[PDB]
Design a protein around this ligand. Structure first.
Ligand code: FAD
Ligand code: FAD
Ligand code: COM
Ligand code: COM
Ligand code: COM
Ligand code: COM
Lengths: 522, 522
């Protein structure tokens, strides 16, 4: 039951295969024990959980010359991301974007006829399940062979006290504990929620044994709900989203949000805000048959055999809080100070366990900062002024302030956007670049070529916000945000070297206005 | 024959329509006269040509409060870019990328069967011709209504002397002249070069009245030759590229270049280096029937009815050099100093007219700098250390030094790349992100998921070069390059906020190594 893999050296593909076998193992599989029993040093920290936060924290701690140990109940490192979160989500979004293109130019050129064409959801999920072990293999390999990490996988950790942990039937002592067990799927307190056909991101890639009907009901207005919803709609199914409040409040710029929502509705998606599910109807077979919810316009009933819950995740703090006596927050999040320290001495908390923002950059960075503090390097971490994004059928990127938001805050501003405000509106061949060229040139599709805008302070000439809808700008926003935080002006932006045609046209458009001492919008 | 449009206000779509009509006008069309005859001020500069360089230079000069006049023989502003250069090229590249995806997953999921499927080239070119007026319309509109520019279109300029120009049958005086007539297609001195079926970027979108056969011969190893070549290959045609020297020398990093070339050959492209065309065979109908070229392995003959020339363009300096007495360079380029000034007083030269690099950022920026000098603001411009890119079936981005190049230069370096160097090689599920997820998860397609690398100086910890093959990183390279020129280290890169999954993984991968005082490659 315990496999000492320490002296074993599997390739990425061999790891992939071994992990799949352990995952399919009916008896549960063997414990993956990778500990250096010859090293006499004491553990500086034991990480409970080896996901994004735990794996990166360990990587950084080891890199600094300290000793660590990861314990994870899964037979692979990397956490939810490669198994049921970020990775599968991006596979689905890719399909959503490709399908919108195929449906828009159905029949034309090399595109097949999509009319009355329904794509198999289970087919795609099966594709994911069949290949998710690839990333898993790289993670175990990279972690062991390249990052020199010690770890025990496929084994739930038993925390004794703030310096003691049991794993693989053994007791380990450490100077510190770093809690990185993340968060779990949100629950919905309504009858029928356990009926067959009700899924969340986690169970979707584990229990989908049938192909969904023609209608899909998504509950939630989160990124996940929108991302998965656009994919389901792209497969050719009627998709209804039930949002408690208003959708995509995360997109502060009003025009940007309207463009995104307008394009979603144009694809046939139905978004009902101010709605609360009251009951999920089960048929005689214990299968979902319909959803009932209360809306501003009253109660409605939608027939469906497939329901996807996109609620927020909740920190896995219950057990740990009891064993260690940790102070918890309003939403079950473990409370920590600016150094990631919990209320218990020598115990840190990172990742989704400490709340939002629940993003990979937050998990990985908090993990590394906790490690640095553990190694004596006092450093604080408080995420703020970061870029963000989400997928619909398009890639949506945003940072800083929206146009209205900036004016309300007292900033005199001018904006540079595309397309321009004219009586032709969105119906013009711009913006345009990689992956939006067909839309830009197609008959009646120009309005689908995208939308983008930068918000500038008229007096300081500094960029206060950037927004983009299309493809190929997400990566750019990572670096653009750094420049903006350093104080980027329209003149400096205009003096850069653009790579035309560019997903973001901020550089050359800025150059067109930068010559005036008195800025004017474009 | 002369239409005074000054007081007319057409919409973007009305401009699009009017331009198309003038372009199709058998008699040649009317002159578009947009001059403010009430303005008593003298012209600070008259721009000969209203393309990228001329339009931007005018925009900036006007923005600074000076008076300008553009004269262009075409009925639209924007130059070659929207009519036969950058724009059509990106439309074709989009098709190339989409077709590779469709052929790789032929039949599977929603993808139709591509086996024995040939895409119509003329169909796509016709699509471009049908919609190119959209961008044209925005240019005339934006220029007139938003940038307040004065211009005379659909009228060749007659330069009298360094202060005098005739347009629309009238004489105009200016304090300066800014030459921005760009460059024209390179010529090939071999028999049969004028046979029907021989095209270059300019004639391809004007004279393609038939659908090409099963084989295509591309002459040149430039970006254009490679970009158009991958598109022709993607349509399902045997594509043979005849390169005089070696292909893609522009990609300095050896591993990056090899990955790009390997993927092209995998798609079925045949690249013959050290080859020189000796003759283009004409059939009894004056149509191309075959191409003969000398190669390192001897003379070869390729049957084909379609030949695309991707030679370098040549500056349109002949006439101007004679009229004004301009000193010219080895390749016909107009010589200028660091202020864009020619050998003739009060005469500047910009864009493709002054040589390489022949890119949009160079054209636009040189145009603006010439304008600033004309307005009394002495500023020098010398393009260097800029990012660059090109299309194959993938987007290829690069900046700075290649790995070998850096070591040769005396830099002690480490590299961070994906996928890693292991016995499984490229056959792993990384790198991966938007538009490469299917390749990453498909059976036998993992090696197609991409390639990327950053070159770092082991001692200074500074990034010396970045390279990427895939999709969605081009835009990022514009901003990343600015950070690198400001002195970016692996630690600073590692401290940024990534947006996972990201086209470039430089941020988190840097973070994985930044913890060590002694850097180690990944
Ligand atoms: C559907 C979905 C899509 C997302 N898309 C994105 C995206 O595009 N971009 C982005 O930046 N973020 C995205 N996120 C969020 C991101 O996945 C998380 O913020 C991040 O994975 C959290 O990392 P973590 O290390 O804190 O937790 P996790 O990665 O969730 O891992 C916690 C780890 O601890 C282990 N563990 C738990 N309990 C125990 C125990 N008792 N004993 C031992 N081990 C235990 C787990 O098995 C797991 O390996 C998405 C999330 C979801 C749900
Ligand atoms: C196939 C192809 C693809 C390309 N792809 C890219 C790319 O992806 N990215 C990039 O950055 N660059 C690209 N380039 C290069 C880029 O298009 C040029 O560098 C840029 O257009 C040059 O701008 P310009 O203003 O100097 O000339 P243009 O060549 O921009 O215009 C010159 C102008 O002068 C006018 N003119 C000429 N003679 C006269 C006359 N006698 N009287 C009046 N007007 C006259 C013309 O009609 C025209 O409007 C590409 C080029 C080609 C050929
Ligand atoms: O953040 S990790 O690299 O552990 C997993 C991403 S797939
Ligand atoms: O893209 S990354 O290499 O960071 C993670 C994949 S497991
Ligand atoms: O003239 S500009 O360079 O703005 C645009 C050509 S698409
Ligand atoms: O994208 S840009 O507006 O710079 C040029 C389109 S003509």
């Amino acid at each position: 039951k315990v496999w000492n893999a320490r002296n074993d050296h599997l390739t990425i593909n061999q790891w992939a295969t071994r992990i799949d076998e352990i995952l399919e193992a009916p008896d549960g599989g063997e414990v993956i024990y990778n500990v250096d029993e010859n090293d006499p040093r004491e553990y500086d920290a034991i990480f409970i959980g080896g996901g994004a936060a735990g794996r990166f924290g360990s990587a950084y701690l080891r890199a600094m010359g300290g000793r660590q140990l990861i314990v994870d109940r899964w037979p692979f490192l990397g956490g939810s991301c490669p198994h049921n979160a970020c990775v599968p989500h991006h596979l689905f979004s890719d399909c959503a974007a490709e399908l919108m293109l195929a449906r828009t130019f159905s029949g034309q050129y090399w595109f097949p006829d999509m009319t009355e064409k329904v794509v198999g959801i289970k087919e795609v999920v099966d594709l994911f399940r069949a290949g998710r072990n690839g990333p898993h293999g790289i993670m175990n390999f990279q972690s062991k062979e390249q990052l020199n990490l010690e770890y025990i996988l496929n084994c739930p950790a038993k925390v004794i006290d703030n310096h003691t942990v049991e794993a693989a039937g053994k007791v380990f002592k450490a100077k510190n504990l770093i809690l990185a067990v993340g968060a779990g799927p949100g629950t919905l307190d309504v009858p029928g929620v356990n009926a067959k056909g009700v899924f969340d991101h986690a169970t979707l890639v584990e229990e989908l044994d049938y192909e969904p009907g023609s209608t899909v009901v998504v509950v939630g207005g989160s990124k996940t709900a929108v991302e998965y919803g656009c994919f389901f709609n792209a497969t050719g199914r009627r998709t209804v989203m039930l949002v408690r409040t208003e959708p995509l409040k995360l997109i502060k710029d009003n025009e940007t949000r309207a463009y995104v929502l307008d394009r979603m509705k144009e694809q046939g998606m139905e978004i009902i805000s101010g709605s609360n599910v009251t009951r999920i109807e089960e048929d005689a077979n214990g299968r979902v048959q319909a959803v009932v919810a209360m809306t501003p316009n009253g109660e409605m009933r939608i027939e469906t055999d497939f329901v996807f819950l996109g609620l927020g995740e909740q920190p896995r703090s219950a057990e740990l809080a009891k064993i260690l006596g940790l102070d918890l927050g309003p939403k079950g999040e473990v409370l920590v100070n600016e150094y990631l320290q919990t209320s218990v001495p020598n115990v840190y908390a990172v990742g989704d366990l400490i709340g939002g923002p629940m993003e990979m950059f937050k998990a990985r960075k908090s993990g590394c900062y906790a490690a640095r503090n553990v190694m004596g390097e006092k450093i604080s971490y408080t995420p703020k002024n970061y870029p963000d994004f989400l997928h619909t059928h398009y890639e949506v990127s945003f940072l800083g302030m929206g146009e209205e938001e900036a004016r309300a805050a007292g900033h005199e501003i001018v904006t540079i956007k595309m397309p321009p405000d004219t009586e032709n509106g969105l119906n013009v061949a711009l913006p345009a670049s990689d992956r939006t060229m067909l839309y830009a040139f197609g008959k009646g599709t120009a309005h689908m070529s995208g939308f983008q805008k930068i918000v500038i302070d008229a007096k300081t000439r500094k960029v206060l916000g950037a927004h983009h809808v299309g493809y190929g700008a997400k990566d750019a926003f990572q670096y653009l945000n750094v420049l903006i935080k350093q104080g980027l002006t329209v003149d400096e932006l205009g003096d850069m070297d653009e790579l035309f045609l560019n997903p973001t046209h901020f550089i050359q458009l800025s150059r067109l206005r930068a010559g005036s001492k008195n800025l004017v919008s474009l």
